[PDB]
Structures are given as structure tokens and as C-alpha cells.
Design a protein around this ligand. Structure first.
Ligand SMILES: CCOC(=O)c1c(NC(=O)[C@H]2CCCC[C@H]2C(=O)O)sc(C(N)=O)c1C
Length: 134
């Protein structure tokens, strides 16, 4: 397993728990309705240690870039400004966010050709499945 295996355009095909996760983050109604309705593509690109993740839906486009292992300021889709670190560890990309004394982790892994995204904050979870598309 390598980080390069995560590269490409991926399309959301299933979501569980996301609304509960957004509620744990304290996201307000407008953004929760967007999160519930949007069916994003995620575009992952990497060159060595540089990683970029872009998302595109009918509602919103987002993007961040980082160096694997380096702490950086991430402005999230819900508007937090987190201290984030991304690492490819034990066959997953792990995105660890810290802000205001809180923490949340997002993992991304290839399983049976699909991109499995899992979110957690304070034992509130979600699982989002994406299929590789052209
Ligand atoms: C604030 C509520 O909306 C959203 O969060 C949201 C996205 N969130 C994410 O991309 C991450 C969310 C956290 C898990 C990893 C990612 C994933 O979705 O798989 S993309 C997106 C869009 N382009 O439309 C929207 C609206």
C-alpha cells in the first residue's frame, strides 16, 4: 500500500453518519444541509511528500495542499481553522486536525478498489465510500 494508490478522481457513492459527525462539530443548519445534499468528487494528487485534496460538487469546491508530516493551517469545508497533519501510515492516509482543544481524525484507504473515508470526533463516526471515476 502506497499513498500514490489513492490518487485520482473519486465520486461519493455512499455516506453513513455524516450528519451526526457535522452535528458533533457544531456545524449550523446551512452547512449541514449542504453536507447532507452534496455528492462530491474528491481529487487526490501527490508527488512524493506533497499532497493536494480538492473536492467538487454542484454546491461547493474546496482544496488544500500540504507536505506529508508537516503541521499546517487547514481551513475546513465548515470553516474551522485547524492545525492539521497528514501522514500515510499503516496503509492509510491519516489527517489529524486539532483546534480549540478538540481533535478529529479523517482516514482514507483503498479497499476492494474503492476509497473508504472514515471520520471521527469524540466517538462520533462516519463512513463515506467513493468509487474511482474518469
Ligand atoms: C460542511 C459540510 O460540507 C462538507 O463537509 C463538504 C465536504 N466535506 C469533505 O470533503 C470532507 C468532510 C470530512 C470527511 C472527508 C471529506 C469528505 O466529504 O469525504 S466536500 C463538500 C463539497 N464539495 O460539496 C461539502 C459540502
Amino acid at each position: 500500500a502506497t499513498v500514490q494508490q489513492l490518487e485520482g478522481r473519486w465520486r461519493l457513492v455512499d455516506s453513513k453518519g455524516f450528519d451526526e459527525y457535522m452535528k458533533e462539530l457544531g456545524v449550523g443548519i446551512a452547512l449541514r444541509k449542504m453536507g447532507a445534499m452534496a455528492k462530491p468528487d474528491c481529487i487526490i494528487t501527490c508527488d512524493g511528500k506533497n499532497l493536494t485534496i480538492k473536492t467538487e460538487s454542484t454546491l461547493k469546491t474546496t482544496q488544500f495542499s500540504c507536505t506529508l508530516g508537516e503541521k499546517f493551517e487547514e481551513t475546513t469545508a465548515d470553516g474551522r481553522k485547524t492545525q492539521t497533519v497528514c501522514n500515510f501510515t499503516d496503509g492509510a492516509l491519516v489527517q489529524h486536525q486539532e483546534w480549540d482543544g478538540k481533535e478529529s481524525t479523517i482516514t482514507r484507504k483503498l479497499k476492494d478498489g474503492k476509497l473508504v473515508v472514515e471520520c471521527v470526533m469524540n466517538n462520533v463516526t462516519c463512513t463515506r465510500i467513493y468509487e474511482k471515476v474518469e
